[PDB]
Structure formats: structure tokens, C-alpha cells
RNA sequence: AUCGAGAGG
DNA sequence: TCTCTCGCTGAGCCTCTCGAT
DNA sequence: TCAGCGAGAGA
């Protein structure tokens, strides 16, 4: 297989043995398709926006001989693009123009938020993600109470008809063996009442269900239900149903029938969706799978008959927690639902206005008011339970958040309502939902992550690919199978061996059928899996040697990989899985090449590519201009940066990585650093799970990170003592004023320490950095003052140079009024006014950049669930050293390997030692300026190692410069890739170690740094990949002595932001009581808080050196007494 | 002020739930006042009396009459009776638990250089916790004339401030508590020492009481203020007093992990080591020989040791004798206090042996010798565990050859059970029980066989003849120690992983006949995920 | 300065005695100005002055003048903390039943009177409270006991 | 409501009765003070 | 010795909860009053001087009550 | 101060 | 005298971040 | 939602 140049620079060795047929699909596809359906123009009108418009319209006008008709809709060009929306802080949305005729004009119907290329919306300058929802599909479901309803223990079967939109409907039993129909989960009534309501006489009811009642094969439940039935006429049943629905319950004949009709048999009030209709017919065994949305009496009779049969024992009860019963609603469907709700709300007012007669004056634009539609859309995009804040720690975090599915949200389970069955996994989760990746808090089991190959059907049911098996030979075509269809067939295992012809070598092959795994003959197999990594999600597939870890530790490692902070200098993982490239490319943090060509110009902030001849358009200039992102904060205050990874004149193909985003290294995902770890106890500085770190790691800034913080100063409008921004500050030093400019705003690039003035104290606590960016917004109409005049001048001067930079390069490849007109509007944007919240004079935003370096108290971790806290920064002369004199970077405790069952870290340590041995050999060969032939020989001998490898890299095709560049990039260690469940075996690791002239066992003799004496036993040392999680002791440390207090209960507030104290809860009070500590409790209940006079008296006493307290009565008791007295109950203190 | 109109940054003012309920009640009452004055018909006057009753219902104990009143959003309003009952009521949020001043919170590290009654805290925490004391003593020394000047000196952080702080925190104890205070030992008083950093340093022996690890776990610190509080912390709260748990007679401060790892390695013997068969003057010569390298730590030697006993009435009497021991035991003998028998250290010291030794020291001598002995034990265990250089490797885990044999016989048995169930002689539940029993027996058998192979299989030669001995394998030492790990972890590392259990019950799908040394396949891992889900759900929901 | 807590029912005269301010007619809260509106849920005459040692009317603002009523508004000058103590009352045109006694337990009114909870529930909701009050006044405890 | 109906009385004998109102609990070092108060009565 | 453990200090009194003797009277009269410590200070803060005094055997409830009676007379 | 959503122990 | 529907009570602790009312 | 408990229903 030929290699792309970005792949050609550094080729990661593969140990996989199973050939792969299906390439990894686009990861974010699930978030891109659905929203596309929401905005694409469909002539059939089946999909979201046009379907909603067609369903709501036309307007009948209520017999007034008027009508309203619409032709089509279009999406206008957005006012701003993504970036300006991010800076100014407005929503990235497009206007929705729809053209209508009245029986012609375009009417504005609000603005629809748009999805960016990655798949994240911009709502108020902050990127947000709408999570897919896993909810039970509309249709009919038969369930049982499992005998726990009553002490008798008899199973109480029931049936439920869940609509996509409408009211529920239930048929259930009682231990008396009688039907009972429940509407909207209200009180029970005899079911035959509804049969009365449907124009059925008693004779017809008895004729429908009977032919003759026996003991086991048939049951006289209908007769008993009719006997219990109080009503006999249709009108009485209808008025009783009305009384159930309406507590007041006036008789009002000719109105109850309207209620019963509109309850279930009206399109505008009740609708069973096409998926619901299909599931309904499939459950009730009907050949046709399309029909009317509204329910029908035949359906009610048939579902009642099916429930009677299931109770009788003819059928089988369904399983609620089956992935063929649950379906996924993405962002497009939810947005369509909300927009339809808004359209109904507005059409109500359209009918109301059309009721009155207006001739020659009414216009289509005039009647429609878009405010409710805009309000509903805005509420959904910004206040829903599924429109969550983005996770922007690293690309893996972004992808995992975007590929999440939640069982919560509207029309879904609540945390308390969830049992112990919805949290457990199901045998149908294989290949559709990851069994590993899940939270550990209250939400476990209720939130999942999509599998790598998982796909969604047109209805919404998850399906997974499989390879067809024909005539006992495995073929290459793939079919996508859903949950229902999988059971009927038999599926072979991905680990089965082949013969290069498709024939199964094994006589009996492992397979899974109907949810159970067993051996099957060769001829019976009908399908096969595509890859060994088909089960795990992306995060779980990024863990090497996953098959050797305990599922708990794999879960913890997958969760912690999403918390790693992007370091200062990215470093590739020496041992990986080969899935890093896909994640890095599909994340969207990198800059990929749209078209091939040659890099004409490279810079720290721009790239210009000269496109090849055959790719350019006939009229296009033929250049591609990429602008990079430099030092912009993320949601979690981390740093987002892009660095070019190409030089002048390099050839570029399609899809090559031009620039590397955060936590990326030449188009690969790089989350942490490689460290030399030795597993041994060292004077108890790694006692429980602590980590001992050398001083070289701190010296080389291997874990230094950049954090960017945003601070805002807003000058409010007040009649008395109005706020101002000016350098004049009463009672301040000369230096503090000097650091400020004439305008009173801090100079860009200045170094500020905690307690300094940014805008004329404001920089908080101990965090200190450099001012990298200052933005200013002023209310429209008010003229800018001082510095803001210069800021817009520099922006305007740069804006001309910015755009003219593309104008000059574009003109280099190749009347003038077409382009300059855009410049005038671009010039207006900076100079014009800006939107601000009412009651605000001006707002200045300042960004600070702080470099955080590791110190004791910082949590660090690995990829196998092994976390810890740095306990000591040991000097270099104290670390244990090898015979050659090279010290180790990290010492880890071997206590945590047996109990915390992750041998994966040991295997990764051995393989990393082998890889770094190969890299050291290559570096030694390269430093002596040996001949290129020896480099070719050694590299080829290294690459050809293995038992039966699928990679087959040949260096004969490589030229001298190519192999020289590859060797230069391979000097720090040859990377190795092990697939998730088909990876390197122990024998191959031993052979690779033997090739690099290192001990086979993987353990070497170490020497004590302090005494220079040999350790008694050999020590396991190697290279392992470590991450720095985003839990830094710099932020968790807090302390309080005396600050501000709450209002109603005079106690200190809670939280580090408000400078509040810690909480002394009930259990601590119980502990103090158990010790018998009576004075400490009395001071922690009265003096330390909640007593107004005790605090001041004790503070004065402590200041004066007297440690004596005079406790009183807490204010909380006073407020309790006052509120109880307010409630109307007299309570008082008697003496 | 009990229902505040809290000010807001913007023009609008936030409104509590009580104010609007009172407003509605006043509205309905005033409607009834004017309407009855106008002599309205009896039919209409009765209607809003029901509304007034409903409003009074809503004002106090809302939601009992059904259809609880909702405000702007779809959330029921909060009534007077909701400020009393519930988790967020005044009883269980502001009276049985409060938020206290003079306190802080931070992460915890190990710092194994401390004594049993000491904890290390950062300077930046102390300078904030002890501000009033610093103000008072700055006024006393005459450096400042008012409170404001001393305050400014505190922000400026001069050297006088650091000297005063060093003087202030000399003997005030501080209370450290973790987040879940399950029992009485969850909060303890320590004597503080200033350290440079941002994390609190906690004595290694105390951790087992707190259930406190160092995986980013945090802790909270409070400072006693008054004289009686200081004495209360010193006499009843200090960690030196809490030697025994209140639930039973066993002690709480028991060496674990690395300490035991060093200790039994010191005390374990080997055959034909370097320096075996030598006579020594005492423990000092043993230490000199070990540090010089003339003899091994596991050599079997004879030492002339002297032991004190308290068998005499209220007195100590000595006896000296030649005893056959090992060198490491001779060094270990040098830290035990006067008045204990030798046989407490003439054996391989597991966790149980060390705990029993501490219990005996407390029973016989007292409390101060017990504290000193615990500190010495921790120091010696750490030092010799470090010098041990014991590591875990992939070649350490060993797999036997009887495992596949017994798995095959168990598979034959379960196949016969399936054949029996295929016939109508037996039901489903009985077959389920039979299969689960068979597989449990097979798992026990494989665990026994593998542990036997790990334990016994070490052969060394003495003067040219073979002999067997207890293994020095790292994994077997880790398991036999009791420091961390059990027989289940080792058996799952070198036998069958066993039978998994769903959150409700057990599952008998297949035998997972694959170690963690030789990797699992996809089906076995999918089966194994059930137990992980069950464990996490059980924890978080029980 | 106390040794016991005594809890009992509150008579209407006791509630009327608790109030420091006259009445609660006007339903208003604030926003006529930044000063609180007269007789409102946040008031000056009823619940005390809002500013320490200063009256709302602004006649005097000195602690040497403490203990004097106001002339423009009639609000006595006192430390603002007293706003955490004072109370007031609302007079209902028609008596209203306390939900705590009628519900949330075996009904106390339902055990004073023999008829079950449903009858009293339908009587209160007009499907009146004055009738229940008259019935509760009608009985004599010793005779029925 | 039962206490209000019955007109009960609380002597503040236990632990939470003193903790809620902010006094010395009748155990440990507060036992002597409680005993002195009882003996005075 | 005395700073680490108070077992010898409580052996003289016999009741651990009777620390009111050490704190409420001795340490207070040392800190606020003009009373001079008996044993040498050794730069120790108060409340450790008193514990040392009870440990050796100069301070107990009867002795402090007797002394209080002595200063009662004029 | 609430609500919603995450996260840690 | 007693077996059954219907209602109301409860469901661990501490800490951090963001947005939106 | 599951799991119990007391008062009220007829049978
Ligand atoms: O929901 C929770 C989770 C955790 N905890 C508290 O954290 C502890 C579990 O979380 P830890 O991860 O800190 O303890 P661990 O040592 O058992 O886990 P590993 O290092 O082996 O990975 C618990 O013992 C408890 O103190 C809770 O109190 N509630
Ligand atoms: N904390 C806070 N509450 C607000 C703010 N604006 C309004 N509220 C509260 C006051 C009312 O309870 C409610 C009014 O919301 P309305 O705009 O739907 O929300 C605000 O900026 N901050
Ligand atoms: Mg922990
Ligand atoms: Zn006045």
C-alpha cells in the first residue's frame, strides 16, 4: 500500500494480524446528517422543515371563505460568520424567508441557528452540543409486573400504546381478572366502556371476542368486565369519560362526543408517526407497513385481542430494554418538533386574526408574527436539558461529547425513575453501544457512547455492519443489520481464521445466535464481524492492551483520557492502537488540505498552497489560503493553538495534515508525554498511589501547560455615584497608576501579579500572567474615548492589510468594483455600534495567560486507570540510575499492579522499552554518519519483524532523502501500534527487545542514587505514556478566616469564588459528640458562625490575646422560630 | 429581611417565592373585601371564597391539595412548610450543620518524614488561617500601631510576618477531616508544621483510619480558637490517643503496603545465603555486616541476644542467650522496646504478626512506647522496602498445566447436565444451580492448584544437594504479605477469572478460561463487563 | 436565660398582638421609588426603618435622636437589625381553614367530628369554613367526653 | 402539628436539643456544667 | 514527652474528661491574670505548662480551690 | 439564592 | 372479624466549573 | 420509580 507524505514521514509499525475490510467511517457523521435533513430542500417534503410547514399549512380561516398558501422557503446569508459571532457574542444563525400567497409576499419567520462544519452550534459566543437521545419508540408494548404488584404473586400483564404525539392509553388487569383502560395514566375504568363509546352494542362486543369459555385455552374476562361495567348506553359511557377527564363534569351533550373524537381520532391532536405505525403493524402482524397516523377502532380491538391472548398464553411478553425497541432522536428531529410547536402557536393567532373581515388591506406578511417561533427556537437552543456546554479539553473529549447518547431529557427517564435494569448492559449492545465507556456517578447506565462502526437507520434504530457469508466463503460486501434482524441469523466471531480464499479453517467456529454464544458447523454460518474493535467506542479503542485490563480499570482509563490537558510541546505515544490518526483528522482541530498542490508560502499564522493544474476551476486563480488559530481560550480555560508542520515547496496531496492543533503531532493524537518509569518502592514517597517525579521533567517543561483566563469589567449606569473608567483612582500608589495608561486600561503584554489593577485589585488571588488580548465594546451612539479610538484604528488598519493580503496573492495567479464593495461593509462593522445588555455603558474584556508547571499536589494518570498525585520533586542525583548512568524520570509503586488489575501498564512498559531501544540504536547509527545502506538494512529488519503482519512496509521504493527523513524522525523512538483486541503477543515483544540489545525479561540492575549501592533484585524499568489531568492543586487550595456572610441566615457563604468557609455537616457533629468534645462543638456552632455578637467579641478577644468566648444563641434558631410563628403555631422560650 | 429582595447587577430585582404567594393571598382577600361591600349576588360571592381558601393553602404547605402553583417556569413554588421539612430545611441545612469560619481545604500527599502526632501544612494556608493571632502579636511587639497597619504588613508579606507566624503556630493543633465522616476517627487533631507548597502532608499510618488514599483525595482543616478548644483537641482528639478503634479491641494504626513489604523481607530466611553459619556478638555486628556487604540479609546465623521481661513483680529482669535467627531479624531486634519476648520477631512478619506485635506492646508496656515503636517500625519498613528493590514483571506471573485439564472435565460435566436438562427429567432452575455449583468448584480447584505452584516451586542447592524452599517470587511475596492483594486477584491473574454477577444476581454464560496474562477475546470481555457495571451501580446506588 | 420550649396553638388575639404595624392592605412591594412603598410587604411603619439610625422621612439621622417617632411618615428610628424581628398580620374577610390540621395526618377536625374526611373536604370546597367553625364552637368537650 | 395540638413541652434533655439551640451537650466536658445546673435546681 | 502524650497527665486526675481543671482555671489565670508559672517555661506556650504541672503533680482541683480560698481572704 | 448540565473524592 | 385499593412518607456526604433566568 | 405502613373499604 502506497503511503501519503504525512504518513511517509513517520510510519507507525503495526502488530495487527487481522486484515481490515471496512475503513473507519466519519466519526461526526451522526451529528452532520440529521441537521442536514433539517435544512435540505426535499421535493417529497417528507423530512423535517418542509414536512412541518406542509403539515401545519394551509390555513382554513374557519369557514370565512379565506385561505393562506405557501410556496417554498429559502435560507438567507448569515449576517456574520462563525468567528465574528464568537468574538462579538451573538448567535450564528441564518434568516428564514418563506414566500406565501393569500387567497404574494415574503415574510420573515425568525432566524434558525446553523451548525458549523465540525457539528457544534454557536449560541451566545460559546460552542454548544446537542446530545442524541435514546428513547422508547412509539407503538404498542406488552409488559408484566412480574408478580410484585400484589401479595398473591400472580403476573399482571398489560399493554400500552405510546404515541409520538398525543395521549397515552393502557389496558391492564387486576387480581380479579378484569380489563381496565387507563387514559393519561388516570384512575381505572372498565375497558368495555370504550367499546360502548365506539358505537358497538353488547351483542357485537360478545360476538367479537367469543365463538364458549374453558379453563386454560380461553377466558371469560370480557363477560366479567361487562358485568362490572356500570353503563349500558353510549351516552352514559361518554359522559362518564368526560367526568373522568373534567372534574367539574357538566353533562353538556353534543360536547362530550367532541372531546372523545378529538382525544384520539383527530389528526391535529393525536398522531402515530410512521415509525410508530410500522412498529404497531409489526407487533400486531400486519403485512402492510404504512397507514393512517390516527388510531382506528380495528387497532383497539386487535390490541385488546392480543393482550387477551398473551394473558391466555398464546403470545410472549416483550422486553423493554431491547435496542430494537429504543430509537435515537438527533438534533434535527428535536429542532423540527420545536419548530412545529412554534408553527402551531402562530397559526392559532393566524386563525384568530383571519376570523375578522379585512378587505383590500390584509397582506400575507402582516398576519404572521415570528416572535413566538423565535422564542421557542431560542429556548430549545440554550435552555434544553440536551443542549449542553461543549467539552473542549482535547480533541478526544470533543469527539466523545459529540458522539454521546443520553437516555435522559424530555420524554425520557428521570434519575430516580430509573431502575436497576435500564442501567445494566444488554446482549443487543454488541456493536451498537460501548459496554465500557460510561460515567461513574448517578448517571451510570443512563448515558452511553456510540460505537465506532455504529450507524442509524432511517427510522432511528441503531444498526451495525457485517460481512456476508456465501456458500461457505466469506465475501467482501457488507450489509448493515439492525437489532431485530440480527437475532434470526447466526453471526461468526471476528477472531476466526481464514485461508486467503474465504474458507473457514476451523471445523467448528464460534458464533452467537439469539443472544447466546456457541460453536457451530461451517455450513450454518451466515454472517461475520468486520473488525476486532467493533465493540468498543473511540475512547476505549484508544487504550493499548485493552484485553489485559480489568473492565473497571478500562472504564476509568477511558474516562480519564478525556481530562488530559494539552501540554506545551506535543509528543507522540510510543505505544498506540493506530486509531489516533482518525481521531485527530476527524476532530476538526487540525487544518486539512482541501486540494492537492505545492506549499507556495508557509508562516506561523498563514499557509498558501499553489493548487495543481488538474484540480483548479477554469476561472479560479488556483491558490488555497489557510488561516490558523493562535492562542484563543477554550471553554475549560485551556489553550487552543495551531502550528504549521510543512516547509516551503513540499508537495501536498488531498487530505494531508497542514497544521497541528492542540494535543496533536504530525496528524496524530498526542495527549501526554513518554516517561522512563521504574516500578519499585522508594522510601515511602509513593506510599498508596503517590508518584515520585525527577527534576529533569520539571527542568525540560515536559508538563508545562498554558491556561487562559477571561475577565470582564462592565461599567453600569447608576444615577448616584455613576461608574466611570479613568486612570484617576483615589488613594493609590504611583506605580499602580504608572502601569495603567492614560485611558486607565492595562497595556497589552504587561506582566500583572495578583492584586494589580487591570481597569481603573481586579486580578484575583495568586494567579498571575501576561495580558495577551484586550477587547472593548461601547453602547451605540456614545463616542469612543481614548484607547478605544486607537484599538479600532489598529483593527481597521489591520483589516485592510488582512484582506489585501489575500487580494495580493489571489491577484498573483491572475471590474474592480465587485470586490471593493465588500470592503466598505467590512469597514463599517468595526466602526459601527455593538449590541449590549440594557443598563450598560461599556464592557472591557481582558485575557491573561498563565504557565502552570507540575508541583506536589498535581494529579497525573496513565491510560490504564492508574492515577496518582506527585509527592516530591526529587533532585537528579537522587533518582536511581542504570549501569550506563541514565537516571529514571518516574518511580511508581508496584503495589497497585496486582490489586488494581491492570497488567496493561506492565505490557506497555516493556513494549515502550523495546521501542526506545530501537530508537536509541537508530540514533547511535545516525550520529556516527554511517552509510545509508546500513540505515536501510536496520530499518527494514526492524519493520519486517513479526509472526504474520498485515503492514508489509518495503524500503526499496523509498529514496535516499525519504529514508533519511524517516530515520531523522525515528531517532527518538520507533512508534508501535497494537489494535484493541488483536495486538502484539509476548513472544513478539521479547523478539523486539532481543533485536535492540536489551534483556528479554525486561528488568535491569538499578543503583541507588544516594548511596551508589546495587539494589538487591532486578527492577522493571521502561517507557510509559503519562497524562496530566485537569485537577491542579493550584486551583483546589483555599483558606478563609473572615469575610462576608449570607443574608437570611448569617452564615459564611459557600464556594471558593465567594471566599467562603467549609461546611461542618451532621456527621462531623456526630464525630465531635462521640469524642465528647463539647467546647469545640459549641465554638463551631455559635462563635465561628451564625452568631452576630459572638464573632465580633471573639475576634476582639483573639486580637487582644485573650482566648475566651462568650457564646449566645444562633440566628438560625431565631429565624426558625420566627417562620414557625408565622406559620400560625405559637412557639416560645419560657424561663 | 427573612424573605430578602436580593439586589441584582441589572435593573430588575430577583423575587423569592414567598413574596408572590403573599401577594396573591392579599389580592384574593382584598377582592373579597370590596366585592362583599358592593352587595354582589350570593352566587358569585361564594366562588372566590374557594379561591381564597386555595390561596391560603398555597401560601403555607403548598402542594398538599393538588396542582401546586407554578411560577414563571414549570417549577412548583416553595411554601412556608417547605422551609422546615426536607433536606434543604432549616433543621438539616442550617441547624444540624453549618459553614464555619477559620477553615480551609486542600489535596493531601504522603510526606513520610513526619511523626505520629504531626501534619504538614502550607505557609499560604497558615498565613490566612491565623490572621487575628498575627495581628494581635504584631500589635504586642510594637511593630504596628493599629489593625490596618498590621493588615497591610500581612498582605505585603515581610519577614517579620513569617517570623511571627512561625512563633504563632508553635503548639496550636488543627483538626483534619475527610469528606465522608463514617465513624469517629474521620476527624483528628494534629500538630502542624509549616511546609513550602500547596498540599497538606498526612502521616502514612493515619491514612487507614481515614480510608484516605492519595489518588487526588482532599481534606479539610479547621483551627480551634479558645483555650478549652485547644485542650479538647490535645487530650481527646490528638492522633496519639486514638490507638484502638471504638468498635472493637483491635488497633487502627497498622503498618501496611510498603512497610510490611520491607519488614517480612527483612525477617524472611534463605538457604545457603552469603555469610550463613556465623556466630555474632549482637544486633550491632549484624547491622555492620549487612551494611558492609560481608553477609546477606537472609543468612541463618546465631546471635547472642539479651531480652528483658516483666515477670518479676513491678520490675524488669534480663536474660542473655544464643539464639538461632537471621541477620535481618537481628537488625529488627534493635528497635523493639525493653520488656518484650524475642519470639515476636523470630518469624516472617505479615500484616497479622505486626498488628499483634503492636497490640502486645500496648498491652504490656503502655502508650508512649507503643507510639515510639510504631514510628520506628514505619521508618525501618520504608527504608528496607526501598533497599529491597522488589518489582512486578510479566515473567513473575506463572500459569500451571492442570488448569486446562480441570476446565475440560468441568466442561464435560456441564455438557452432561445440559443433556440431562434436554430430557424432561429435570427443570431449569435445578440445572442453573447445578451448573453454577460445578463452575464454582472448578474455580476453587484452579485457584488451589495455581497457588500451590506459585508457593512451593523454588529449588536451591546447598553444598551440592538440591532442596526446596518458600519462593522469593515477587507476586507470591505480595500475596503472602497481606500488604495489598488477596488470593482472588492472584487467581484471576493466573487462573480462571471465574463467574460474573449481574446487578441483581449471577450469570452462568460461559467459563472465562483466559487469564489477564494471556488476553481475553471479545466475547469474554463482553461477558465480563456485566460484573463491572454491577459493582459500580451497587456502590453508587447502595 | 431559658430552660424549656413551649409550643401550642396561636389565638387570633395573640397574632394581633405580635404585629408592630397596623395592617396589610395594599399588596405592593416596591418600585414607586428606591424607597419602599407604604404599607407594602417591605415597608417602613410596619417592619421598621431601612437605614441604620436614620428614618425614611429623613427628619433626623443621629443616634442622639434615637427613640423618637417620625413626623412625615411616623416611622420610629432604630437599628436596622430589628427588621429581622418585627411582624405583621392580614385580616381575612372570611375565615380560612389551616391545611395542616385538616390534612397531612388523621384529620384533627376529622376526629373532633364523627363524619369522615370526605364530607369535610366537600364542605370546605363548597361542593364553607364558617360552617366548620360554627360546628367546632357548637360542641362542649366535657359533655361529649 | 401533634405537638401544637397537645401543647407539649421540651426540657432539652438530649443531644440535638442542645446542638440546635447552641449550648453545651450533656456529655464529655459539658456533663459537669449540666450537673451543676441540675444541682442548682 | 508531655507535648506528645498526656497519659501521665491524666493518670494523676484519673478522668480524661476532667480537662476543665487544666484549661478553664490554670491556663486562663496564667494567660490573663498575673499568676506566674511554677515549672520553667522552656519557651513553651501556655496550656502545655499547665499540663506539665499536673503531670508532675503541683496542680489539681483541690489545690486550686484551696489557693482560691487563700486569695479570698483580703 | 435557584434551576439545569457536567466533574472529582 | 378481615382481606383488599388508595395515599403519603422516605430514599449518604463534601467539593469544583459553566449558563440562565 | 420500588418498598412499607396506616386508615378505609366492602364480603
Ligand atoms: O460516590 C462516591 C464515590 C467515592 N467516594 C469516596 O472515594 C472512595 C472511592 O474512590 P477512590 O478512587 O478514591 O478509592 P479507591 O482506592 O478504592 O479506588 P482506586 O484507587 O483503586 O482506583 C470511597 O471510598 C469514598 O471515600 C464516596 O464517598 N462516594
Ligand atoms: N440570579 C439572577 N436571577 C435573575 C436574573 N434576571 C432575572 N432573574 C430571576 C428573577 C425572577 O425570579 C426570574 C425572572 O425571569 P424572567 O426574565 O423569565 O428570574 C439575573 O440576572 N440573575
Ligand atoms: Mg482516593
Ligand atoms: Zn417623619
Residue numbers in the entry:
A (entry chain I): 1 to 103, 119 to 226, 337 to 885, 918 to 971, 1021 to 1341
B (entry chain J): 248 to 789
C (entry chain J): 16 to 142, 181 to 198
D (entry chain J): 1333 to 1373
E (entry chain K): 1 to 74
What is written in the article reporting this PDB entry?
Our biochemical data showed that UTP can be misincorporated opposite template dB in an in vitro transcription assay. To distinguish between these two scenarios, we solved the cryo-EM structure of E. coli RNAP containing mismatched dB:UTP at 3.28 Å resolution and derived an atomic model from the density. We found that the configuration of dB:UTP base pair in the active site is consistent with Watson-Crick like geometry, but not the reverse wobble base pair geometry. Intriguingly, we also observed strong density for the TL that allowed us to fully build intact TL (β′ residues 916-1146), including the insertion motif (β′ residues 943-1130). The dB:UTP base pair adopts a Watson-Crick like geometry with an active, closed TL in a manner that is analogous to a canonical matched natural base pair. We found that the dB (imine):UTP pair in a wobble geometry loses a hydrogen bond as well as 2′-OH interaction between ribose and R425 of β′ in pro-gate loop. On the other hand, in the reverse wobble conformation for dB(keto):UTP, there would be a strong steric clash between the UTP and the pro-gate loop of E. coli RNAP (the conserved region of yeast Pol II (β′ 425-431, rpb1 440-460 in yeast Pol II)). In our assay condition, we found that the UTP was still incorporated effectively with two keto-dominated 7-deaza-dB templates, suggesting the dB (enol) form is unlikely the major driving force for tautomerization in dB:UTP Watson-Crick-like base pair. Based on this biochemical evidence, we modeled dB (keto):UTP (enol) in our structure. Our observation that the B:U base pair adopts the Watson-Crick U’s enol form, and not the wobble base pair U’s keto form, serves as an example of base pair tautomerization during transcription.
Artificially Expanded Genetic Information Systems (AEGIS) add independently replicable unnatural nucleotide pairs to the natural G:C and A:T/U pairs found in native DNA, joining the unnatural pairs through alternative modes of hydrogen bonding. Here, we investigated how two components of a synthetic AEGIS base pair: B and S, can be selectively recognized and transcribed by E. coli RNAP in vitro. To further define the structural basis of base pair recognition during UBP transcription, we solved structures of three RNAP elongation complexes containing template–substrate UBPs in the active site. Strikingly, our structural studies reveal that the trigger loop can adopt a fully closed active state in all cryo-EM structures.
